[PDB]
Amino acid sequence: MPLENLEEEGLPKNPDLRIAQLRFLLSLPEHRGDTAVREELMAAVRENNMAPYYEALCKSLDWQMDMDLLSKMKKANEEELKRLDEELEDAEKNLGESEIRDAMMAKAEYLCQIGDKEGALTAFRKTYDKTVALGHRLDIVFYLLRIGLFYMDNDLITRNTEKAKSLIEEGGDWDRRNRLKVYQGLYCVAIRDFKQAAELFLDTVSTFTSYELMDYKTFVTYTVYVSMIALERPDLREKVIKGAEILEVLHSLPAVRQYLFSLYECRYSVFFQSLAVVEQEMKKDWLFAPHYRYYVREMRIHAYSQLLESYRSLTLGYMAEAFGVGVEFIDQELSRFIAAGRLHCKIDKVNEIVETNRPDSKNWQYQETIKKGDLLLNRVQKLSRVINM
Amino acid sequence: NVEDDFSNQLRAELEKHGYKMETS
Amino acid sequence: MEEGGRDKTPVQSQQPSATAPSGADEKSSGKERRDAGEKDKEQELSEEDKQLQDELEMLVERLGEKDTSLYRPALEELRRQIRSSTTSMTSVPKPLKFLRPHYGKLKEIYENMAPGENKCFAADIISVLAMTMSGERECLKYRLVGSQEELA
Amino acid sequence: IISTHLAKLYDNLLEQNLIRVIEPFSRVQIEHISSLIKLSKADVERKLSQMILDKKFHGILDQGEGVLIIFDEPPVDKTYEAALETIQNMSKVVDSLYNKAKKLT
Amino acid sequence: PAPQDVEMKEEAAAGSGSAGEGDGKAAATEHSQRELDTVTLEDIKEHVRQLEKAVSGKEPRFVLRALRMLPSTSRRLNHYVLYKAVHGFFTSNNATRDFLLPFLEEPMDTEADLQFRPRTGKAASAPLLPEVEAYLQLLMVIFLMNSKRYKEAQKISDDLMQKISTQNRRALDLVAAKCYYYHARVYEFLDKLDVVRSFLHARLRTATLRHDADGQATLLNLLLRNYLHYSLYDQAEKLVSKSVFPEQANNNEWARYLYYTGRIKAIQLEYSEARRTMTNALRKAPQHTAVGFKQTVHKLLIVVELLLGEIPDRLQFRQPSLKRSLMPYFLLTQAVRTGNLAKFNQVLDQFGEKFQTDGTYTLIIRLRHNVIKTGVRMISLSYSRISLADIAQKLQLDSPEDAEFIVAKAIRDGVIEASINHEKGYVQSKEMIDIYSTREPQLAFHQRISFCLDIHNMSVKAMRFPPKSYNKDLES
Amino acid sequence: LNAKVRLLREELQLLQEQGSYVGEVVRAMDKKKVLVKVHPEGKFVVDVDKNIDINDVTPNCRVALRNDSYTLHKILPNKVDPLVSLMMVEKVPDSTYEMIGGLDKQIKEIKEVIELPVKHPELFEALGIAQPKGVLLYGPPGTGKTLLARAVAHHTDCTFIRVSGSELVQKFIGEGARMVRELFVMAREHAPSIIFMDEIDSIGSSRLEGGSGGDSEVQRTMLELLNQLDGFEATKNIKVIMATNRIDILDSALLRPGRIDRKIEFPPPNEEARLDILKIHSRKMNLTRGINLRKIAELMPGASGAEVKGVCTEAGMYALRERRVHVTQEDFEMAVAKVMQKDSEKNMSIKKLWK
Amino acid sequence: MVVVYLASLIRSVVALHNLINNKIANRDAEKK
Amino acid sequence: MDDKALLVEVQLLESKTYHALSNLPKARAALTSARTTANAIYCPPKLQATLD
Amino acid sequence: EFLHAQEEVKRIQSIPLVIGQFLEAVDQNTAIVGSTTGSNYYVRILSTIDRELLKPNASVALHKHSNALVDVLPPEADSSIMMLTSDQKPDVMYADIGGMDIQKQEVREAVELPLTHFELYKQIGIDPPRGVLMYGPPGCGKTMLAKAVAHHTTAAFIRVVGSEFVQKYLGEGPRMVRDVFRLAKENAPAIIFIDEIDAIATKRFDAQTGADREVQRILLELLNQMDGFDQNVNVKVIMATNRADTLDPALLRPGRLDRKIEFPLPDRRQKRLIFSTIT
Structure with missing residues (x-):
């Protein structure tokens, strides 16, 4: 459910339409009692303004904190503090297992709200430790994970998702599995591995019905953006376009649906202006990516690939119009992209052929073998050197 | 070093809308 | 059972008494052997003395929770002790009284538990104590003859 | 329900009919195949274009010359593939090999 | 008191050294002697025992506390590292030495096999006498290089370590061989005008007559490092070529040789080879002894890689965590990539002094060819036929005509490989779109097969040598 | 390489030697020979080997034989017995009380x-007179007699060897009716053990009413040896667990005093029981969506326990069809229905247009 | 190769130790 | 414990929606429950036709 | 010399050979086996070839000249020809019949899927499917469904009748009951099918009738097999009967056989499918 908060963060990250989301972002810490925490979440947003608060500036677009946001925070910590103490007292009276862990979570929330991040993490470990069912242990990891995802600090997210996945078969906490599927996909977007996200998301929709987690419909929409970015058309074709998920929702999909339709129609002018549209509505609406530069390279390389894959020759004009990006730009990107060999092409600009060496040929299979092969020799030498003396 | 692609993001979206008309 | 965490008296017990006999009596194992033998220090022997009345009471609850699994893990080591070997012979006023309940613990293991091993371990502790104690020992046997609960 | 059914019927028809015309390989012209297949010029170009990507005939379409080339059988890929497989397994191993080695120096 | 706590560890130090000598003396056990002697023993002797616990006044307590002057002088040798005739030539914190109270412990264990009673010191003739003497010096040199002692102490090392030895043996020459190299690094660091090279050359003649594999390998690598400092190019070029530099050498030896060979090759316009050895060198070099030279390899290498036309990553700068020191080189990386000369010339002169220390400055000036080369290289490879006019607008070259000569020269060098057709005026890529018709996939595989076979032959011989050495010497 | 060459060469000559069998030394004789009873062939009296002797091999011990000379080789603790074949299917016991x-x-x-x-x-011997005789587990199939028997084995620390009430179960060297003694010898050796004597007494009708009968005849003797030979009268380390479905419906041999001293009654399920048993199974199989274990327990109790096991398993099968990897509520509830109606259809037959 | 070397390193400790044990035994004798 | 002819009809209509997306698994599971109560007619002609 | 020596053993590994069944290992060196020649043997296991995948239960071959265990046979070998479905096989499939499509999917789900795939059932976490009891009207091709899935697996099928379970030498009959089930485990994936239990699953038996004694044992052993099978990957007994009143109502009941399937006696649609084949 708190997945909305991540959508607020994301849109300002690329500096375009930031203005409205900045305000909406600010409102969430009042409720929570998160004043201090906000500065930390602000960090994730980076490459745009997020600095102004009641305790800071009021000059830039990002929204000022209320006098009320501050006061609510004072209330919340007092109240949290009161709950923690109260919860322990009740624990002495009755069962040890359930009651005590609930108490430690109160302590972690209290430290997490004032801003003592280190303090919150030692407390959170305590929670995990205490003897209760595995099912109950999972419930406690999901809150910290969401919080972790917000800051986009990598370490926190790794730990939680990884243990959470183990427990499912062993406990038999299949019921928890539903929240978890969505949670695995969040992790998967969060590292610079959009590849994983594309396979992960598609699975997530079919196995999900409901058990205390964000709507079904929201995921499907999100599935399309990951699916396209990572996957090439034959994989994409089977999975989403023939598959159930995208069709059932129908509405609220047009940016993404326009992409799939255009790609089917195979008129590349139409696909490229929809690339841009799905980049602005969907892709920038995610905070996710520990280096944004990787996200941009993958969307351009994918679209490029489709155009080049279909044709061994194109005239330069058809290719250049289809992209809609500059001579300077096309060239500038192309030099980086070719090295990888996902494109594997070259531009005969003076006769006007866009030739493709073919990423399905002998030239390709060689490029990979050699590239891996040479580096392996250097490695045998480093191992060999240690062993003799 | 740092990828020129990032700087390219803002510039590439806008280019697309104009370019298609400008050149065939 | 030589623990200063309470099993014996480094200070006056009352908490483990009720609790321990049901599952397998842990309290009396360390109390009779370990405390007597390590400290024959007389101020420490007085705590045990105060404890002594409690010690008598332990026999009726112990007969309530009889059952072969409950009884077998509880005592193997009391059986083994010798008074002259803890050298608790060398203080007569307070150890002599500690022997009065100590016997009452042993008798259940000796016959009721039928195997050959329990009898033989049990013999060595009764004899040494009986000869040294004599006159008071005759009274001690009579108390047992009657039985705290009149069972088997 | 009807639309979906009709659509599945459409993708299959399109693939069956193509195989017969294409079959000689080499550089068959988009136009000669078009006539035989029982299609229009505009429609065939588009159908072929979708198909290369899908690899539903394993050819390449050349829009610069205006011919459809179908990929002929090439010499062995096998040689490269066995090398590729051997080198990847050795890379996993190297990572394990170094750690124990640390003990020496 | 203070020397009592570290006393436990001095007996430990003595255990490992005494054995090492023992081994050497019985025939050729050579392989086992060099692994023990270098990084392994040294990382422990200095760091764990002296620094960590505190008390560096246990080093001249270790090589003297009997009062041995030795039959050929080495009394001075021991003084200069630590405790010159006063409290500490660096760190004292010793209440017993041989100038504070003689004796408190015996690391000497009453037997000539590191040290022994004063009876040896004033005169002996034993066959145990050369063995202890060579050894004596290894123990001392261990603190010298780590702590970076300087001054007169540095100057007088050479005298004692060689020209007291001109007769050795294979066992003894190996030990001495290691001692000379450590002193040589300490010498290099001060940037003294007093000739480092002269001693190292004199030491070489002794190395060669015993015909000890070890002596040649150690001296030669250092002799190149000395040569770079003075900046006398011709002698180093010849010296590198002569070095066969054995396959069975310590890890620090391997990293340092490749590194020198790379510096030499880079100016030469053999940068493809220089960059591979230099990248390798950084990885291969340790965490402890290597640190002075190590720094220098990462700084130089960034310039050297550019010389090939490699574009070095940001991860390279961040990951060892040296990014600050590397910051100027980072600027050159940007300048090379863009293709415009004005930024490259400006940086070269301004950081000029800083570069000269590291020995980069001669390599920095070579990048002017490279500024343009690296930018034309990305553009020629990526595309097929592109105009000289495209190359010039993007790269910020003067003229298409200017860009045309520049590409011509590069294809002659053959690190961009192309043929230019100045008809219409494009630069054309070489490409066959099938390499199966050519031998190249086979040739690539075949090269690996030779390289692989070399590992098998190297491994069969190496494997038995240490257990064999242990058998004769007797193992518990 | 020398060694490898040698191994094969020695292996070849050593092996060529014809014959090599198995026997059992039933007994030894004063001629310092031992009687060997070769199991499907003639009996042979042979001299002791230098590998093992009369001191080394105690009576009614299985042995290896070498050559056509039927000389001793090694001692085998094992014997071919139907018990061995019953263990293979049994596998590893499971469940708890x-x-x-x-x-x-x-x-x-x-x-x-x-x-x-x-x-x-x-x-126990001391406690009363003599050692406690057989015990009887009975109950509805909502305690499941054989399954309970596997749950007991972990606690007691015994090797569960299930023992058929049949003694036509051997045809190894002859019928079990004939060779009652072998079952006993193996049983002792692999002590402690639980011999689960399963005779449900819903086999036979006239056999139950009467005292005589072939099945009754053979069964009676196997029990009588347990007393006569002792080791279920000197000891009870090996427990004879009889199983029947009722207090009284027993065959005359099982029923009579002196091979009985205990009979135990367990109820059929209740909501409270059904909760426990369903929970434990649910976690193993696949737990349902939002938990509705409580609902199913409240609504109605299981006919047996088997029925609750069946509901969890059946649920998992439906979810696969769906393209899931886990059960939902929709599957879990459907499973309950499908197992219980089928039971109620099979069991009832007063319902034709009644209730 | 690498496996035999890790073992070879362990053999080294025993083998060094032997030369030192002899030393310690020679010294105990000369000191009485 | 309940199936009825009218309950099946909801499931028949759900299968139809699933067929149109191009997904057989969830539909196949649902088909089973629906045909079983159907076997013995107990329904007006409209239900029968939907099940068919 | 090693190459010359290996030659010599190969010859022995090959014929002449005499078959047995290998029960169990008492040593890696030597093991205990039973022959078809009427001798139980202690035979040596050949060295410089594996003796450690020798150890499980399987058919085995012993050399005639040397009296040793030189090599192993599959568990497939030495099957009876007395037995059904090892000189027959079914040729039917789902397409070949029309109706009872609902019933066909249930049988298929239970029998066909675990054999082919052990992994799917594991991931979900449930115990693989138990056997299916088939009872219904005569001639609706209840058994036909059992044929169609059996054919699809491409694995061994052991098919026995009730009559084959009971004796062949008097009192052989209970022993035979143990044999059939274990034999299927050695050559698993496999299916055990019982056409008839018309006098075996009936509660009523005597012992005053000598004949009844073997039969009352076959029923008791069949109850047991179901217990031992559970909490493992062994699928239960798949059986065919005429009615639902021959079997016991309180010794066999659901969740010991997952699915107990009745075939519709009224079924309008099933008949529509029979006519449509003609169409």
Whole structure:
């Protein structure tokens, strides 16, 4: 459910339409009692303004904190503090297992709200430790994970998702599995591995019905953006376009649906202006990516690939119009992209052929073998050197 | 070093809308 | 059972008494052997003395929770002790009284538990104590003859 | 329900009919195949274009010359593939090999 | 008191050294002697025992506390590292030495096999006498290089370590061989005008007559490092070529040789080879002894890689965590990539002094060819036929005509490989779109097969040598 | 390489030697020879080997034989027995008193009876007169007699060897009716053991009413040796667990005093039991969506326990069809229905247009 | 190769130790 | 414990929606429950036709 | 010399050979086996070839000249020809019949899927499917469904009748009951099918009738097999009967056989499918 908060963060990250989301972002810490925490979440947003608060500036677009946001925070910590103490007292009276862990979570929330991040993490470990069912242990990891995802600090997210996945078969906490599927996909977007996200998301929709987690419909929409970015058309074709998920929702999909339709129609002018549209509505609406530069390279390389894959020759004009990006730009990107060999092409600009060496040929299979092969020799030498003396 | 692609993001979206008309 | 965490008296017990006999009596194992033998220090022997009345009471609850699994893990080591070997012979006023309940613990293991091993371990502790104690020992046997609960 | 059914019927028809015309390989012209297949010029170009990507005939379409080339059988890929497989397994191993080695120096 | 706590560890130090000598003396056990002697023993002797616990006044307590002057002088040798005739030539914190109270412990264990009673010191003739003497010096040199002692102490090392030895043996020459190299690094660091090279050359003649594999390998690598400092190019070029530099050498030896060979090759316009050895060198070099030279390899290498036309990553700068020191080189990386000369010339002169220390400055000036080369290289490879006019607008070259000569020269060098057709005026890529018709996939595989076979032959011989050495010497 | 060459060469000559069998030394004779009873062939009296002798091999011990000379080789603790074949299918026992049962009373009542005589049989002998005789587990299939028997085995620390009430179960060297003695010898050796004597007494109708009968005849003797030979009268380390479905419906041999001293009654399921048993199974199989275990327990109790096991398993099968990897509520509830109606259809037959 | 070397390193400790044990035994004798 | 002819009809209509997306698994599971109560007619002609 | 020596053993590994069944290992060196020649043997296991995948239960071959265990046979070898479905096989499939499509999917789900795939059932976490009891009207091709899935697996099928379970030498009959089930485990994936239990699953038996004694044992052993099978990957007994009143109502009941399937006696649609084949 708190997945909305991540959508607020994301849109300002690329500096375009930031203005409205900045305000909406600010409102969430009042409720929570998160004043201090906000500065930390602000960090994730980076490459745009997020600095102004009641305790800071009021000059830039990002929204000022209320006098009320501050006061609510004072209330919340007092109240949290009161709950923690109260919860322990009740624990002495009755069962040890359930009651005590609930108490430690109160302590972690209290430290997490004032801003003592280190303090919150030692407390959170305590929670995990205490003897209760595995099912109950999972419930406690999901809150910290969401919080972790917000800051986009990598370490926190790794730990939680990884243990959470183990427990499912062993406990038999299949019921928890539903929240978890969505949670695995969040992790998967969060590292610079959009590849994983594309396979992960598609699975997530079919196995999900409901058990205390964000709507079904929201995921499907999100599935399309990951699916396209990572996957090439034959994989994409089977999975989403023939598959159930995208069709059932129908509405609220047009940016993404326009992409799939255009790609089917195979008129590349139409696909490229929809690339841009799905980049602005969907892709920038995610905070996710520990280096944004990787996200941009993958969307351009994918679209490029489709155009080049279909044709061994194109005239330069058809290719250049289809992209809609500059001579300077096309060239500038192309030099980086070719090295990888996902494109594997070259531009005969003076006769006007866009030739493709073919990423399905002998030239390709060689490029990979050699590239891996040479580096392996250097490695045998480093191992060999240690062993003799 | 740092990828020129990032700087390219803002510039590439806008280019697309104009370019298609400008050149065939 | 030589623990200063309470099993014996480094200070006056009352908490483990009720609790321990049901599952397998842990309290009396360390109390009779370990405390007597390590400290024959007389101020420490007085705590045990105060404890002594409690010690008598332990026999009726112990007969309530009889059952072969409950009884077998509880005592193997009391059986083994010798008074002259803890050298608790060398203080007569307070150890002599500690022997009065100590016997009452042993008798259940000796016959009721039928195997050959329990009898033989049990013999060595009764004899040494009986000869040294004599006159008071005759009274001690009579108390047992009657039985705290009149069972088997 | 009807639309979906009709659509599945459409993708299959399109693939069956193509195989017969294409079959000689080499550089068959988009136009000669078009006539035989029982299609229009505009429609065939588009159908072929979708198909290369899908690899539903394993050819390449050349829009610069205006011919459809179908990929002929090439010499062995096998040689490269066995090398590729051997080198990847050795890379996993190297990572394990170094750690124990640390003990020496 | 203070020397009592570290006393436990001095007996430990003595255990490992005494054995090492023992081994050497019985025939050729050579392989086992060099692994023990270098990084392994040294990382422990200095760091764990002296620094960590505190008390560096246990080093001249270790090589003297009997009062041995030795039959050929080495009394001075021991003084200069630590405790010159006063409290500490660096760190004292010793209440017993041989100038504070003689004796408190015996690391000497009453037997000539590191040290022994004063009876040896004033005169002996034993066959145990050369063995202890060579050894004596290894123990001392261990603190010298780590702590970076300087001054007169540095100057007088050479005298004692060689020209007291001109007769050795294979066992003894190996030990001495290691001692000379450590002193040589300490010498290099001060940037003294007093000739480092002269001693190292004199030491070489002794190395060669015993015909000890070890002596040649150690001296030669250092002799190149000395040569770079003075900046006398011709002698180093010849010296590198002569070095066969054995396959069975310590890890620090391997990293340092490749590194020198790379510096030499880079100016030469053999940068493809220089960059591979230099990248390798950084990885291969340790965490402890290597640190002075190590720094220098990462700084130089960034310039050297550019010389090939490699574009070095940001991860390279961040990951060892040296990014600050590397910051100027980072600027050159940007300048090379863009293709415009004005930024490259400006940086070269301004950081000029800083570069000269590291020995980069001669390599920095070579990048002017490279500024343009690296930018034309990305553009020629990526595309097929592109105009000289495209190359010039993007790269910020003067003229298409200017860009045309520049590409011509590069294809002659053959690190961009192309043929230019100045008809219409494009630069054309070489490409066959099938390499199966050519031998190249086979040739690539075949090269690996030779390289692989070399590992098998190297491994069969190496494997038995240490257990064999242990058998004769007797193992518990 | 020398060694490898040698191994094959020696292997070739050593092996060529014809024959090599197995026997059992039933007994030894004053001629310092031993009688070997070769199991499907003639009996042979042979001299002791230098590898093993009369001191080394005690009576009614299985042995290896070498050559056509039927000389001793090694001692074998094993014997071909139908018990061996029954173990293969049995595999590894499972379950505990709690899963099956659910109520704290059920677990206490089984536990005291069974466990304590294995721990110390000497005590029991003293306690009454003689050692406690067979015990009887009976109940509805909502305690499941064979399954309970597997749950008991972990606690008691015995090797569960299930023993057929049949003694036509051997045809190894002859019928079991004939070779009652072998079953006994193996049983002893792999002590402690639980011999689960399963005779449900819903086999036979006239056999139950009467005292005579072939099945009755053979069964009676196998029991009588247990007393005569002793080791179920000197000891009870090996527990004879009889199983029947009712207090009284027993065959005359099983029923009579002196091979009985205990009969135990367990209830059929209740909501409270069904909760426990369903929970434990649910977690193993696949737990349902949002938990509705409570709902199903409240609504109605299981006919047997088997029925609750069946509901969890059946649920998992439907979810696969769906393209899921886990059950939902929709599957879990459907499973309940499908197992119970089918039971009620098979069991009832007064319902034709009645209730 | 690498496996035999890790073992070879362990053999080294025993083998060094032997030369030192002899030393310690020679010294105990000369000191009485 | 309940199936009825009218309950099946909801499931028949759900299968139809699933067929149109191009997904057989969830539909196949649902088909089973629906045909079983159907076997013995107990329904007006409209239900029968939907099940068919 | 090693190459010359290996030659010599190969010859022995090959014929002449005499078959047995290998029960169990008492040593890696030597093991205990039973022959078809009427001798139980202690035979040596050949060295410089594996003796550690020798150890499980399987058919085995012993050399005639040397009296040793030189090599192993599959568990497939030495099957009876007395037995059904090892000189027959079914050729039917789902397409070949029309109706009872609902019933066909249930049988298929239970029998066909675990054999082919052990992994799917594991991931979900449930115990693989138990056997299916088939009872219904005569001639609706209830058994036909059992044929169609059996054919699809491409694995061994052991098919026995009730009559084959009971004796062949008097009192052989209970022993035979143990044999059939274990034999299927050695050559698993496999299916065990019982056409008839018309006098075996009936509660009523005597012992005053000598004949009844073997039969009353076959029923008791069949109850047991179901217990031992559970909490493992062994699928239960798949059986065919005429009615639902021959079997016991309180010794066999659901969740010991997952699916107990009745075939519709009224079924309008099933008949529509029979006519449509003609169409």
